[PDB]
Design a protein around this motif. Structure first.
Motif, mmCIF file in Angstrom:
data_model
loop_
_atom_site.group_PDB
_atom_site.id
_atom_site.type_symbol
_atom_site.label_atom_id
_atom_site.label_comp_id
_atom_site.label_asym_id
_atom_site.label_seq_id
_atom_site.Cartn_x
_atom_site.Cartn_y
_atom_site.Cartn_z
ATOM 1 N N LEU A 1 0.808 -1.204 -0.095
ATOM 2 C CA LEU A 1 -0.011 -0.011 0.031
ATOM 3 C C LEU A 1 0.940 1.333 -0.124
ATOM 4 C CD1 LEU A 1 -2.801 -0.929 2.466
ATOM 5 C CD2 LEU A 1 -2.702 -1.625 0.060
ATOM 6 N N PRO A 2 0.235 2.374 -0.629
ATOM 7 C CA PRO A 2 0.915 3.534 -0.678
ATOM 8 C C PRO A 2 1.583 3.764 1.157
ATOM 9 C CG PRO A 2 -1.230 4.073 -0.974
ATOM 10 C CD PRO A 2 -1.005 2.718 -1.068
ATOM 11 N N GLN A 3 2.808 4.517 1.261
ATOM 12 C CA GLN A 3 3.182 4.748 2.429
ATOM 13 C C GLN A 3 3.035 6.443 2.524
ATOM 14 O OE1 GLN A 3 5.638 1.097 2.406
ATOM 15 N NE2 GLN A 3 6.932 2.775 2.524
ATOM 16 N N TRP A 4 2.713 7.343 1.638
ATOM 17 C CA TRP A 4 2.187 8.671 1.755
ATOM 18 C C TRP A 4 1.122 8.894 0.898
ATOM 19 C CZ3 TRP A 4 7.295 7.242 0.519
ATOM 20 C CH2 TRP A 4 8.370 7.591 1.312
ATOM 21 N N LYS A 5 0.017 9.909 1.561
ATOM 22 C CA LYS A 5 -0.751 10.359 0.632
ATOM 23 C C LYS A 5 -0.223 11.266 -0.490
ATOM 24 C CE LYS A 5 -3.761 12.116 3.307
ATOM 25 N NZ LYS A 5 -5.081 12.480 4.355
ATOM 26 N N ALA A 6 -0.888 11.447 -1.699
ATOM 27 C CA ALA A 6 -0.413 12.480 -2.479
ATOM 28 C C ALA A 6 -1.357 13.753 -2.209
ATOM 29 C CB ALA A 6 -0.535 12.213 -4.023
ATOM 30 N N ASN A 7 -0.696 15.002 -2.322
ATOM 31 C CA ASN A 7 -1.403 16.184 -2.133
ATOM 32 C C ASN A 7 -2.082 16.289 -3.528
ATOM 33 O OD1 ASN A 7 -2.566 18.716 -1.696
ATOM 34 N ND2 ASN A 7 -0.845 19.194 -0.459
ATOM 35 N N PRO A 8 -3.286 16.437 -3.733
ATOM 36 C CA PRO A 8 -3.815 16.981 -5.018
ATOM 37 C C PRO A 8 -3.448 18.371 -5.397
ATOM 38 C CG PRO A 8 -5.522 16.014 -3.749
ATOM 39 C CD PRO A 8 -4.587 16.380 -2.804
ATOM 40 N N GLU A 9 -3.396 19.164 -4.256
ATOM 41 C CA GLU A 9 -2.819 20.585 -4.723
ATOM 42 C C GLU A 9 -1.435 20.788 -4.955
ATOM 43 O OE1 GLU A 9 -4.281 22.863 -1.371
ATOM 44 O OE2 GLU A 9 -5.983 21.749 -1.064
ATOM 45 N N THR A 10 -0.636 19.618 -4.680
ATOM 46 C CA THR A 10 0.978 19.789 -4.970
ATOM 47 C C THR A 10 1.358 18.985 -5.966
ATOM 48 O OG1 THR A 10 1.522 19.108 -3.138
ATOM 49 C CG2 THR A 10 1.402 21.309 -2.879
ATOM 50 N N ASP A 11 1.024 17.601 -5.933
ATOM 51 C CA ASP A 11 1.491 16.386 -6.646
ATOM 52 C C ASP A 11 0.531 15.829 -7.214
ATOM 53 O OD1 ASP A 11 4.393 16.537 -5.867
ATOM 54 O OD2 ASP A 11 3.206 16.798 -4.085
ATOM 55 N N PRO A 12 -0.464 16.291 -8.146
ATOM 56 C CA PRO A 12 -1.413 15.505 -8.815
ATOM 57 C C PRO A 12 -0.924 14.418 -9.927
ATOM 58 C CG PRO A 12 -1.096 17.651 -9.845
ATOM 59 C CD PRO A 12 -0.267 17.670 -8.607
ATOM 60 N N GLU A 13 0.221 14.286 -10.033
ATOM 61 C CA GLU A 13 0.884 13.154 -11.033
ATOM 62 C C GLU A 13 1.051 12.169 -10.030
ATOM 63 O OE1 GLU A 13 2.157 16.293 -10.586
ATOM 64 O OE2 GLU A 13 1.257 17.019 -12.399
ATOM 65 N N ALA A 14 0.874 12.189 -8.846
ATOM 66 C CA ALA A 14 0.819 10.938 -7.937
ATOM 67 C C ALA A 14 -0.534 10.357 -7.549
ATOM 68 C CB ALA A 14 1.626 11.321 -6.654
ATOM 69 N N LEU A 15 -1.568 10.834 -8.383
ATOM 70 C CA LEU A 15 -3.025 10.302 -8.180
ATOM 71 C C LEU A 15 -3.235 9.480 -9.576
ATOM 72 C CD1 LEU A 15 -4.766 13.582 -7.052
ATOM 73 C CD2 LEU A 15 -4.070 11.735 -5.246
ATOM 74 N N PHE A 16 -3.987 8.535 -9.072
ATOM 75 C CA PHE A 16 -4.570 7.656 -10.386
ATOM 76 C C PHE A 16 -5.536 8.779 -11.006
ATOM 77 C CE2 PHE A 16 -3.510 4.425 -7.242
ATOM 78 C CZ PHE A 16 -2.793 3.391 -8.149
ATOM 79 N N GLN A 17 -5.541 8.571 -12.505
ATOM 80 C CA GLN A 17 -6.241 9.144 -13.556
ATOM 81 C C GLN A 17 -7.477 8.666 -13.502
ATOM 82 O OE1 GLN A 17 -4.827 12.090 -14.915
ATOM 83 N NE2 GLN A 17 -3.139 11.649 -13.905
ATOM 84 N N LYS A 18 -8.608 9.738 -13.687
ATOM 85 C CA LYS A 18 -10.055 9.284 -14.258
ATOM 86 C C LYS A 18 -10.051 7.971 -15.056
ATOM 87 C CE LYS A 18 -12.092 13.539 -13.429
ATOM 88 N NZ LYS A 18 -13.270 13.686 -12.375
ATOM 89 N N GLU A 19 -10.904 6.982 -14.864
ATOM 90 C CA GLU A 19 -11.046 5.852 -15.368
ATOM 91 C C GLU A 19 -9.980 4.926 -15.451
ATOM 92 O OE1 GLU A 19 -14.296 8.142 -18.480
ATOM 93 O OE2 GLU A 19 -13.248 6.206 -19.151
ATOM 94 N N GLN A 20 -8.804 5.020 -14.704
ATOM 95 C CA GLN A 20 -7.931 4.126 -14.562
ATOM 96 C C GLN A 20 -8.266 2.671 -14.014
ATOM 97 O OE1 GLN A 20 -3.808 6.454 -13.461
ATOM 98 N NE2 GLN A 20 -3.481 4.167 -13.735
ATOM 99 N N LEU A 21 -8.221 1.703 -14.247
ATOM 100 C CA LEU A 21 -8.254 0.454 -13.575
ATOM 101 C C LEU A 21 -7.542 0.012 -12.139
ATOM 102 C CD1 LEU A 21 -9.902 -2.508 -13.386
ATOM 103 C CD2 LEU A 21 -7.881 -3.164 -14.389
ATOM 104 N N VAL A 22 -8.009 0.103 -11.021
ATOM 105 C CA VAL A 22 -7.165 -0.203 -9.739
ATOM 106 C C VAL A 22 -8.030 -1.246 -9.054
ATOM 107 C CG1 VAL A 22 -6.635 2.296 -9.532
ATOM 108 C CG2 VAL A 22 -8.982 1.590 -8.552
ATOM 109 N N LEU A 23 -7.200 -1.673 -8.025
ATOM 110 C CA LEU A 23 -7.661 -2.513 -7.050
ATOM 111 C C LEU A 23 -8.110 -1.594 -5.859
ATOM 112 C CD1 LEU A 23 -5.275 -5.650 -6.968
ATOM 113 C CD2 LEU A 23 -8.003 -5.627 -7.583
ATOM 114 N N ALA A 24 -9.156 -1.603 -5.404
ATOM 115 C CA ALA A 24 -9.671 -0.678 -4.046
ATOM 116 C C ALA A 24 -10.388 -1.667 -2.979
ATOM 117 C CB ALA A 24 -10.566 0.228 -4.918
ATOM 118 N N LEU A 25 -10.487 -1.059 -1.727
ATOM 119 C CA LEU A 25 -10.944 -1.904 -0.724
ATOM 120 C C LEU A 25 -12.232 -1.509 -0.770
ATOM 121 C CD1 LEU A 25 -9.450 -3.255 1.845
ATOM 122 C CD2 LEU A 25 -10.171 -1.431 3.149
ATOM 123 N N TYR A 26 -13.305 -2.395 -0.847
ATOM 124 C CA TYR A 26 -14.677 -2.463 -0.974
ATOM 125 C C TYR A 26 -15.242 -1.869 0.504
ATOM 126 C CZ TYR A 26 -19.372 -3.131 -2.745
ATOM 127 O OH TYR A 26 -20.744 -2.805 -3.012
#
Lengths: 175, 5, 176, 4
Positions: free
Chosen positions: A100-125
């Motif tokens: 799992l990630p060990q940091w959260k990405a700040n959308p305001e400073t590092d948006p490249e470290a977020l998944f893009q809309k419509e990307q396939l991911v595994l996510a906790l239900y």
């Protein structure tokens, strides 16, 4: 009881995930948000992972787990289920463990470290401790926000759940 | 683990 | 210029497929698999290199490693175009190693970038890398990625799908 | 370098 304990544990781990705070010039590191681990990365004892485990009756699940050890002799992890009802410590190949990630990405400073809309991911239900295939619906706007995702779900005529919220701690690549 | 029902 | 493009395309073409073996996982620098922790690219290796112009403008370019100095922890790299003054001394975070193998879609799809992933990709008929989204990963060993470049000349901000070889698509180390 |  168990149900409360589990849901509290999830919140603890999601909320305590540190925010990446770089300065001008710095790039978000491996395991910040969506930035993948380095090649040949080995997770440390205590790190949270998604772990692909089979039951005795055969169905594969990606479960929320914690690393216990890694053996360089056999290239295998041992992991423990975050749930005390999972009484089996699992020995797993590297391809069955996603850090799992060990940091959260700040959308305001590092948006490249977020998944893009419509990307396939595994996510906790929600209301579970397991990960499932989903498409990103919306990234977080602020550091406190969850992703919203559409889970693959065959109970829906179009094959997707409504948007459901998942913290950055609990969204990883689906490769 | 708790799975999706 | 024509000859340069010929060599660049050939370099994409000749990147070997990772064959591996049944039961195995792809190595670092196969396709999208990132470099190992603390990796140092080797002289002659191809890289994306982030060059700051005298006026401050930042551009990722195709380059080749010349050397690495433990004294300073910097690389020297040479601009692939070999023109004028080609050499640049750069920090490690300004150098992304290009893949050393193509990931074979038929055996190692896990080592390919996936639809909607943000990447740096070499723009066709240039030696420069720019931000793009993956439109489709390859399905045949010889096939390119299809990508949508960010492009302000379109109202919706994206190019039509353009083809870029596996050698020339890397992780996105660039802010907008 | 050759730019776009």
């Amino acid at each position: 009881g168990r149900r409360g304990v589990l849901m509290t544990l999830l919140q603890q781990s999601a909320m305590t995930l540190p925010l990446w705070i770089g300065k001008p010039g710095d790039k978000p590191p491996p395991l910040c948000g969506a930035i993948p681990a380095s090649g040949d990365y080995v997770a440390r004892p205590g790190d949270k992972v998604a772990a692909r485990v089979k039951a005795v009756d055969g169905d594969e699940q990606w479960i929320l787990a914690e690393v216990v050890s890694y053996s360089h002799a056999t290239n295998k992890y041992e992991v423990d289920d975050i749930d005390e009802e999972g009484k089996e410590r699992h020995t797993l190949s590297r391809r069955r463990v996603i850090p799992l990630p060990q940091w959260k990405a700040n959308p305001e400073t590092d948006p490249e470290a977020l998944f893009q809309k419509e990307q396939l991911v595994l996510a906790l239900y929600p209301q579970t401790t397991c990960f499932y295939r989903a498409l990103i619906h919306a990234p977080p706007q602020r550091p406190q926000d969850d992703y919203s995702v559409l889970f693959e779900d065959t109970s829906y005529a179009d094959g997707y759940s409504p948007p459901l919220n998942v913290a950055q701690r609990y969204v990883v690549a689906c490769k | 683990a708790r799975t999706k029902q």
